[PDB]
Design a protein around this ligand. Structure first.
Ligand SMILES: CCCCCCCCCCCCC/C=C/[C@@H](O)[C@H](CO[C@@H]1O[C@H](COS(=O)(=O)O)[C@H](O)[C@H](OS(=O)(=O)O)[C@H]1O)NC(=O)CCCCCCCCCCC
Ligand SMILES: CCCCCCCCCCCCC/C=C/[C@@H](O)[C@H](CO[C@@H]1O[C@H](COS(=O)(=O)O)[C@H](O)[C@H](OS(=O)(=O)O)[C@H]1O)NC(=O)CCCCCCCCCCC
Lengths: 200, 200
């Protein structure tokens, strides 16, 4: 669903929507990805837990950051839903860049049936800055579990008898509001000065 | 708490107790371990979700396996709480072996302040059999994030001004009923023929 004119993101509908994402991690076809899935669900659960304390006070994602800034003083933004969403957005951003890169025909012509170059760009853009050396190594090792581009798209459809070309068009359509939403979240962190750069 | 004479493990108290374990993963002192924590909590949450449907029907862990065998026929044991507990026990077992190995003075004399040999034995005994080649590599990479033995024990106390010797005695005491409980769980899977050996 698109953004309102005021670009405020409603927390309830947002959480409803993003809870559809973790299951997709089996479109990757390896148990290597199950811990990532659990990790992302954890951020969603935390934001949900905060939201459920006072859906009115926490009606928008902006409100979450505002109220928590006040509630936590010097520990903010490394606290609460503000912290879980700071990490969730980076996961969302990684997915966005990865998909877009694939949709844009970016590839290694030496190895066109893979998705390493797309995941690597996605990692560099969304996460690398916030991760130390050992996590970068674990990411680099994790990539050997990544499905073939073929299989990945196939899985985003299913046995669903549809072309690669069709699947990519649907992904392209999807990316429009997905990207716009994530850009509003990143903009909100920037303007509230809530972004932390610690390397984990 | 010890086992009853009938060795039946009550589900409610078990879940209460094991929910204390995931937080310990920060005793390891690296965000490398956060996905593992989320993974283990996921198994606990799933068992809890099943238990909450009918605490009477699911009063013991044995009951879980029994009722699910019946409910799921040919998909059992790769289903439900039986599957989450099959994986939880392996995590519990890994922790047990790791601790015991440390308590038993097992070490690499070339590198005594580390815990690699203890984690490696723990991995070989609890998990290696169920994991493919890429996960074994990720485990092997993860170990470079492992704390020094010193720091690990220190963290199991805290600033808590207590000796290594003291901490290990408390761990030894802890391991008695911990181990006995886990042995009953493994025995139950064996006798119900509910163990799956698929390599993930
Ligand atoms: C045999 C078993 C061996 C397995 C051993 C380990 C396996 C490797 C696991 C490590 C992999 C690296 C991934 C690291 C992830 C997390 O450290 C980071 C930070 O996570 C946050 O840490 C936080 C603490 O922050 S800190 O105070 O700054 O430390 C919080 O705990 C926060 O929780 S919450 O309560 O706020 O909601 C939590 O998510 N998470 C991320 O990096 C996001 C990962 C998004 C993944 C995007 C998709 C990747 C796809 C990969 C496929 C190629
Ligand atoms: C930048 C971001 C990069 C990060 C990318 C990935 C990082 C690496 C993550 C992979 C690490 C390997 C660990 C793999 C764990 C899991 O695959 C396995 C199986 O997990 C189960 O899979 C299951 C599916 O089973 S299957 O049908 O057979 O596939 C279920 O999904 C089950 O969920 S539940 O719903 O049943 O409750 C789920 O736990 N889990 C384990 O191996 C247990 C791990 C215990 C860890 C013990 C402590 C390790 C400490 C390490 C420190 C040295």
């Amino acid at each position: 669903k698109p953004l309102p004119a005021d670009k405020q993101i409603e927390t309830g509908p947002f959480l409803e929507a993003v809870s559809h994402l973790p299951p997709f991690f089996d479109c990757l076809g390896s148990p290597v990805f199950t811990p990532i899935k659990a990790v992302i669900s954890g951020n969603i659960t935390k934001i949900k837990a905060v939201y459920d304390t006072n859906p009115a006070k926490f009606r928008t994602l902006q409100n979450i950051l505002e109220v928590e800034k006040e509630m936590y003083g010097a520990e903010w933004p490394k606290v609460g839903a503000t912290l879980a969403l700071m990490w969730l957005k980076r996961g969302l951003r990684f997915i966005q860049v990865f998909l877009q890169s694939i949709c844009d025909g970016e590839r290694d012509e030496n190895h066109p049936n893979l998705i390493r170059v797309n995941a690597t760009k996605a990692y560099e853009m969304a996460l690398k800055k916030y991760h130390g050396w050992i996590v970068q190594k674990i990411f680099q090792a994790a990539l050997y579990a990544a499905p073939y581009k073929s299989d990945f798209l196939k899985a985003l459809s299913k046995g669903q008898n549809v072309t690669e070309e069709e699947c990519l068009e649907k992904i392209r359509l999807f990316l429009v509001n997905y990207t716009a939403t994530i850009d509003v979240i990143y903009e909100m962190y920037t303007q509230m000065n809530a972004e932390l750069n610690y390397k984990v």
